[PDB]
From a paper:
Herein we present the development of a PluriZyme, TR2E2, with efficient native transaminase (k cat: 69.49±1.77 min−1) and artificial esterase (k cat: 3908–0.41 min−1) activities integrated into a single scaffold, and evaluate its utility in a cascade reaction. The reaction proceeds through the conversion of the β‐keto ester into the β‐keto acid at the hydrolytic site and subsequently into the β‐amino acid (e.e. >99 %) at the transaminase site. In addition, we report the crystal structures of the TR2 enzyme and the newly designed TR2E2 PluriZyme. It presents the typical type I fold of class III ω‐TA observed in known structures present in the PDB database, and it contains the characteristic pyridoxal‐5′‐phosphate (PLP)‐binding domain composed of β‐sheets and the catalytic base Lys289.
Diffracting crystals were obtained for TR2E2 as well. Datasets for each crystal were collected and refined to a resolution of 3.3 Å. Only purified TR2E2, which retained approximately 80 % of the original transaminase activity (k cat: 69.48±1.77 min−1), was capable of hydrolyzing pNPA, pNPP, and pNPB, with the latter being the preferred substrate (k cat: 0.41±0.05 min−1). This variant contains two mutations, A172S and Q173H. The artificial esterase catalytic triad was observed in the TR2E2 crystal structures and is composed of Ser172 and His173 of chain A (magenta) and Glu317 of chain B (green); similar to the transaminase's active site, the esterase site is composed of a functional protein dimer. The RMSD between TR2 and TR2E2 was calculated to be 0.71 Å between 299 of 389 C_α atoms of the aligned residues, indicating that no large conformational change occurs due to mutations, as also confirmed by the transaminase activity assay. Notably, the distance between both active sites is ≈20 Å, with the esterase site being more solvent‐exposed and located at the beginning of the tunnel and the transaminase site being more buried in the protein structure. Structural analysis revealed a 20 Å distance between both active sites, with the esterase site being solvent‐exposed and the transaminase site buried in the protein structure, thus ensuring that the transfer of the reaction intermediate within the protein structure is theoretically possible. When the residues Ser172 and His173 were replaced with Ala, the activity was completely abolished. Thus, the insertion of the hydrolytic site helped stabilize this region by adding two internal hydrogen bonds, improving the thermostability of the enzyme. The finding that both TR2 and TR2E2 retained high activity at 50–65 °C was consistent with their denaturation temperatures (56.23±0.09 °C and 61.85±0.11 °C, respectively), as revealed by circular dichroism spectroscopy.
Author numbering:
A (entry chain D): 36 to 86, 95 to 318, 323 to 459
B (entry chain A): 38 to 455
The structure:
């Protein structure tokens, strides 16, 4: 229960300075305590609560987004973005005369939204059972999770394997029934599932020989999360559509959006114009300001220049702890792995509860940090300073140590 | 693009009376400076609401207490979401998953009406009845059916309304006997259809439908995205047409337009079940779409119930609006003036006594809408059907304003066509 929140810190009803390593929900990229936003909202509510903010917002988004992404359809949340995506991908092919080409393909343990459509896309089999949630035209392949899937196959080789999974499904369904393939650059919600560096190279190959669109879900990855403006350009992907949201406002306003490549855009706008526009004047004003800040203060550049590479090595230095098996780390996102043993490699029995115990103990020490099973993940704001990465390593250290004896002693 | 009260000024100092409440949303009118203060306030504190680490004074707490006060007695639990179109995607999920936990997983069908609107997501455009939306790919997703709209004008213009009302409402019973009673999960409708012209049902309809949903074993879902927060002169159209809905999405009006908000009111009946086994029903959004949105909305309702905007609607200015409007029924092109509370429609026809609709009525309405704003009125058209939802802060001197601008507009379209 916080009472004060600025910079990378919160403050309980007790007054401990808890450091938000998670950045709320992966989204307060420019950090708490920016009154510069709250004023642009105040004065945008004076002007108009309905409908200008949508235009200046669209300008900045075409500057920061590479490639042929020059048009943008805003929405209320990234959960609604993926809906528009699915709809306009089938609409794309329908306006090409291939209306049977409507099958979009996700991965297992990927997250793409809470809406019926987004949840059908999202591969959390927890969300899928409750009501009918594999709405016709969504398929689920393997995730490029090295640790979990094949912890001993060579990353170089395991990587090719998890992408040709895509090609396997394609040849299974009918290349002409597949509309597109969608996937987070790095699955965030389902733990930090970083793919090997052979994965996206093959995906790009499959999405060229087999005529499908690539859709890349940049909701957690967008707006600096990987030390680049988008996970897109950090893996040299040239997507056809990107749902952007959490980063947009840095977490202060409900705004979602889809970036569209000129390929899909042209057909949708020219041979269509019947699919109305924009999002919400307030939240757009607010969003366009958070990007001004990030652009002039360059804290996206600082994100790569200074605080990322430092935060990678330091995190990797956590991998030697007795509990830590793997120490994944790309840009301002990273993750550890809680295993009973490393040399014998015994995967913790029900690691859900043990990782839930480090989270529980991580705030007792004064660190925000998410568990997902036996995976401790972090996603600090892009304003975190090189000094505070040391605050982070230190408070994780005590936590893992405390839990190293807590299961190997107290009520084992 | 500046706005003050019920007026939208633009570049050339053009005071345009907004008779559309933007999009049925801006209810307490524009230029309520005290909402900006509550957004500036909350925005300065935390901007998320996870079960680990809450806020000082959680806004969704205040809000969800208030929504219990102004909603039908038996509704007392509110999930929040990002917009009202999200609210229905939730409801589709809830109504179904309600039966799975009553052990009837084959009970997954939702029935709507054609030309009903229910969101713009893949499910809200499946639910919704315009086939424009259905034709993109195949937006009708399984589980949904559609029955006939009780649109007395375009369906059976000469029938007896209480007869026809009773006839379009046996439609529901006649989809159940075609579908199988144990398959149907629920039936969802707006108290009055909004975005598809204002389809004011014959009084004898909601009477019947409540019976059909007693006799049959189905939940009920009343879409109050538009009818909610005073539109019908009652807080919710439910109270207007004495409906007791098991779910109810709410939205446009929750924040009177000021902030992206959605929400679903769960009747005690369905709530009892979705709580016993609800650890499974844990999704990313959970509740509290945004503390800032909730903070703003909570104050919005403060302003609404304390100055009394809902009450002076259905008791003072709504009556006035209805009377004035119907003085337009006595016009050449106009061959019906309907409305309730704070919503109203004019039908345009090529001849009154020979009831003769236009070859392509849509285009005439586009003209009228183009001619309304020219003369200084926001007035939307659904085909050949003009509609209006003025902000509930409307003053009498301004429905007078609202009527005369309509009069010119109708007299200029009458010229233009002839």
């Amino acid at each position: 229960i916080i009472t004060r929140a600025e910079g990378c810190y919160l403050w309980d009803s007790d007054g401990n300075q808890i450091l938000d390593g998670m950045a709320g929900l992966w989204c307060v990229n420019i950090g708490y305590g920016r009154k510069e936003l709250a004023e642009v909202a105040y004065r945008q509510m004076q002007e108009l609560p309905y409908y200008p903010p949508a235009i200046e917002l669209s300008r900045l988004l075409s500057e920061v987004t590479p490639k042929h992404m020059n048009h943008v359809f805003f929405t209320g949340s990234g959960s609604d973005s993926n809906d528009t995506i699915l709809r306009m991908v089938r609409y794309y092919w329908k306006l090409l005369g291939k209306p049977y080409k409507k099958v979009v393909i996700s991965r297992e343990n990927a997250y793409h939204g809470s809406t019926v459509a987004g949840a059908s896309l999202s591969g959390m089999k927890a969300m899928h059972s409750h009501g009918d949630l594999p709405i016709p035209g969504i398929e689920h392949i393997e995730q490029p999770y090295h640790f979990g899937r094949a912890p001993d196959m060579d990353p170089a080789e395991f990587g090719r394997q998890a992408a040709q999974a895509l090609e396997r499904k394609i040849d299974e369904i009918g290349e002409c029934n597949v509309a597109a393939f969608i996937a987070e650059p790095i699955q965030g919600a389902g733990g930090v599932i970083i793919p090997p560096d052979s994965y996206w190279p093959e995906i790009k190959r499959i999405c060229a020989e087999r005529d499908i669109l690539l859709i890349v879900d940049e909701v957690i990855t967008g707006f600096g999360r990987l030390g680049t403006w988008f996970g897109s350009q950090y893996y040299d992907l040239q997507p056809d559509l990107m749902p952007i949201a959490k980063g947009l406002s840095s977490g202060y306003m409900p705004i979602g959006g889809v970036m569209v490549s000129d390929r899909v855009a042209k057909v949708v706008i020219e041979e269509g114009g019947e699919f109305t526009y924009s999002g919400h004047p307030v939240a757009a004003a607010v969003a366009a300001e958070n990007i001004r800040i990030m652009r002039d203060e360059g804290i996206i550049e600082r994100a790569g220049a200074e605080i990322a590479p430092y935060l990678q090595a330091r995190w990797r230095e956590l991998g030697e702890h007795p509990l830590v098996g793997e120490a994944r780390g790309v840009g301002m996102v990273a993750a550890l792995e809680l295993v009973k043993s490393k040399q014998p490699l015994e995967r913790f029995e029900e690691p859900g509860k043990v990782g839930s115990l480090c989270r529980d103990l991580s705030v007792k020490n004064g660190l925000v940090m998410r568990a997902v099973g036996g995976t401790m993940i972090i996603s600090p704001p892009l304003v975190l300073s090189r000094e505070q990465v040391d605050e982070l390593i230190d408070k994780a250290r005590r936590t893992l140590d405390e839990t190293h004896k807590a299961i190997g002693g107290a009520l084992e």
